[PDB]
RNA sequence: UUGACCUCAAAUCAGGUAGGAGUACCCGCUGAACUUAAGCAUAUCAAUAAGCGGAGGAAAAGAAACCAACCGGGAUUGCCUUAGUAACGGCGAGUGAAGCGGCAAAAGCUCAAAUUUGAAAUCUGGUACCUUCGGUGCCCGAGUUGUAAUUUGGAGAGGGCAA
RNA sequence: UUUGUAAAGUGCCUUCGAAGAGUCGAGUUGUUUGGGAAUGCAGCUCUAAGUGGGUGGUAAAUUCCAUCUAAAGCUAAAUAU
């Protein structure tokens, strides 16, 4: 049992393992699959990007906070400083975390100067129609990094 | 026995149209392996449980 | 303001009014054809040497009669086919389950004058 | 050969009636020359002709029902669609595009505006 | 409004008036069936708030459920096992007996649909509670999109998979670092935790 | 005396619905022991197999009575890492998560609680018609022990003012 | 067809701003957890509150702070097969 010169291993296999492993096989398969998604709602979202804007943001903990981070959404307090308001923001693609506070003046003026570079940048098709195809670029977090 | 239900009877009669040899033309028909009967069911040898 | 009487000490269900039934539609589309008709009655004669010798010699026919009949269904079924009173019927259930119904004819009527008429001789 | 369905479509029940009862005679003196011969096919191609006029008679007989209880409510259960017993429970189409009447609002409000990030 | 004070009624219990209703219902309830019909509801602002809008199709069932600990099976109180596991009269029953209630009127009325269930009275023999069904198949709530969310195949039977206000709860389910063995419920996030993850290059 | 109300019934009343199967995956209850500890009574196997109740094409969970203690993050789920770690354990045998971080996928919302009181404005069923998964009229019924509209925690309501 | 003197949103001021109880929480008991003077569930017993409540992973009092709103509810895709 405990021999010659050999470290205190820990293997926590006493149960029955062999009932719950899962190998991943599917691997490269599902990735196939997940770019056939972002191929089939590619050809759905009319064209507009895939995903929305997200927010900087500055990140929590000690280690982590000297980085800065792509957030969920913008406050209720950095889009009505954009110019526009929270609903008519979720429907443009600006996506909004009604829940977070602004306490710190840098991430307000960054996300609001983001969603200024945003809103100049874009062109909104009519509500009626004549609907000039504009050519959709597929990542808007990567076209505003 | 002797005597009997009609359930019984009824199984007895099934048992008695199953009891016989293959046809003898299926021996001649095309992509054919079955060569007897593998069923026959005697009385003096199973007894078939009704 | 006053009391009914009550001369039994027991209390049971007011007689109330059971209604009929009257459907929104009918139970199934169509009302089902006659399932057991006197075609479907009597099946094959049989001709057998000892069936073909009662018809001969006993005045009586001997029919393969379906399973699910009795003995008013073929005393109405041979008068429906052939036309010719019928005395009483004997109906056993053969060893391979297809029953068999030995119908004696009155004495009017000769059964191998209608055993060649039906055709089975 | 025996008849044909196109052939009796066009007959009548009483017709169709006759038809039947002339052909459930023919099994009759079909099934006693059967033992006095050794084999008989033909008595295959009358029965199957008895199978389609008692498809052709029940044919008649349904869509016509279907024509006395035509665009009301409640119609037998054999005459109502069957599908499986999943798509005949929860709801319908009307019953599970309703909306409440502020969401009907909030929808005719802030549609999803499509957009694009070019320029 | 008046459900504010019929609120702050409810909440006084050991009051006159409360102990002298709480009295006369217990007796009343006590005298009628296990699972029997409510004509309405006796605490109208609770049902109100827990989903009874009063109008065709919504059902009250009063119910009673026998009062105490567990007591397990295995006759004669012999357990056969180690020492650790020989207990028969102190068991607990993880589910509660709100949970037994609903369970009970969803098997009674089946056609039904229980949506949450309340607290109305109890002795030290039995807890009384009020459940509070939902018709799926009727046309006023098949419509009105409020509630025909319960209509769904996949809500058939929420009192006996711990979908209820109660259910969830004795699921151990909310957020936390107090609910971590069950959080997303527990038995997923016991077999994802024991699961032997591994790739096609091993990592 | 007749008519309502309430509560409880009866009908082969009108129309509906439930059971049973399959159970690979899911949601719960209930629940062992072999075994490991080189013996065994806590432990371990294992919150497992067996038993039972319930669903679906996924189920569950889900828009924080959360994590944090940072320059703070933001519903849920899953993967890589944290991590064989902090901790529990005859502190033995063993057991053993979570926040942060990178990514996949990202969609948010609804009742109760406020007199609409110059007007239940809501809903079901029957009947008639039709451009019949539904629409309109009329008539009963539910319902004010309260159905609709307005609001739901991020806001919001009643007023006043200018666009 | 133009469904319509209807609906919706934006700005300023004033009066407000209703928010879920035998439930939260606590004692004991069983069970479970990695949860350690009690992590979750549950039985009984006691039973709240309103500038309140819960949590902030050693019990307790005293003075602050922080962070979210319980005891009612719906919801795709990533995921398992």
Known sequence: AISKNLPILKNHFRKHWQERVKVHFDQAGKKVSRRNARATRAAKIAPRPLDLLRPVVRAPTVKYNRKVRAGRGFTLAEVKAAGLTAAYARTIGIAVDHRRQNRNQEIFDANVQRLKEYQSKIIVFPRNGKAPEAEQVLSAAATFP | AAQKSFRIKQKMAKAKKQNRPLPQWIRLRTNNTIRYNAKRRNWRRTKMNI | ?121 | AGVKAYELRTKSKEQLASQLVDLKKELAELKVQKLSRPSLPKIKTVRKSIACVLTVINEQQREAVRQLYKGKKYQPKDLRAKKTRALRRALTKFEASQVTEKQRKKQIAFPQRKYAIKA | GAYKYLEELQRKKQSDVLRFLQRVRVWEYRQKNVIHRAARPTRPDKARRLGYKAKQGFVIYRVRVRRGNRKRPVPKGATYGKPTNQGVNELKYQRSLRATAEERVGRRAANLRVLNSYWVNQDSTYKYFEVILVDPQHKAIRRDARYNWICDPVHKHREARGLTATGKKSRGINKGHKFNNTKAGRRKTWKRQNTLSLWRYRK
């Open chain 3, 1 to 121: 303001k006053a009391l009914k009487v009550r001369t039994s000490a027991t209390f049971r269900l007011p007689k109330t009014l059971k209604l009929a039934r009257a459907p929104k539609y009918a139970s199934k589309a169509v009302p089902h054809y006659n399932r057991l008709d006197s075609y479907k009655v009597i099946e094959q004669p049989i001709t057998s040497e000892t069936a073909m010798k009662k018809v001969e010699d006993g005045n009586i026919l001997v029919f393969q009669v379906s399973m699910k009949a009795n003995k008013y269904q073929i005393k109405k079924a041979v008068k429906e086919l052939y036309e010719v009173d019928v005395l009483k019927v004997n109906t056993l259930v053969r060893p391979n389950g297809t029953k068999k119904a030995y119908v004696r004819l009155t004495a009017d009527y000769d059964a191998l004058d209608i055993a060649n008429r039906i055709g089975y001789i």
